[PDB]
Design a protein around this ligand. Structure first.
Ligand SMILES: CC(=O)Nc1ccc(CN2CCOCC2)cc1
Length: 185
């Protein structure tokens, strides 16, 4: 892929974060805290899962960013509609406004309904996410493996502005405390 030149500087939106998340001063790193992080509730916060959005909203053009997932056991990454459900239980699917991949229990899967098995030979330490708004495309790249394609959602029906989407995952195991980090351009 030669998508690097559509690179955008993503920052995390504290107001959307689940109340257990800890976001760094530069708004580029997020991890699961061991308790409630002493913030007020609001209608934006994801209540049920350790999720947060980027502050940027995209309604046109081509956008590319990279995320570090080093030593995590579980995470979700991709984009979502600005209008996605925040409260209660929901599944990650394009019908619910999400275009995502994840690691869970030693397998990688794309967030279709039902979910799709991914075939990755080199476990990624950094993921590239490419959005072409006009083409209706979301693609995922394995930066550890020289940029090899992971998955492409095509014929996407975005149906509104898009936000970068993150889930640090739970840490029931004690092996998933590590942060997600937005990588420098
Ligand atoms: C039964 C079943 O398939 N469970 C399941 C639930 C959630 C996800 C999505 N992500 C995975 C990474 O951790 C955060 C959540 C994937 C699988």
């Amino acid at each position: 892929h030669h998508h690097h030149h559509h690179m955008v500087h993503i920052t995390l939106d504290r107001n959307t974060a689940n109340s257990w998340l800890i976001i760094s001063k530069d708004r580029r790193q997020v991890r699961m805290g061991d308790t409630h992080q002493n913030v007020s509730d609001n209608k934006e916060r994801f209540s049920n899962y350790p999720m947060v959005l980027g502050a940027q909203r995209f309604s046109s053009g081509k956008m590319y960013w990279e995320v570090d997932v080093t030593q995590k056991e579980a995470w979700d990454l991709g984009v979502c509609r600005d209008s996605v459900q925040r409260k209660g239980q929901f599944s990650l699917s394009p019908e619910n406004g999400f275009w995502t991949i994840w690691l869970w229990q030693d397998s990688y899967e794309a967030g279709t309904s039902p979910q799709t098995t991914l075939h990755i030979q080199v476990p990624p330490c950094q993921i590239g996410i490419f959005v072409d708004y006009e083409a209706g495309v979301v693609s995922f790249y394995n930066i550890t493996d020289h940029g090899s394609l992971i998955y492409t959602f095509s014929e996407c029906v975005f149906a509104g502005p898009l936000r970068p989407f993150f889930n640090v995952g739970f840490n029931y195991s004690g092996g998933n405390a590590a942060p997600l980090k937005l990588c420098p351009l």
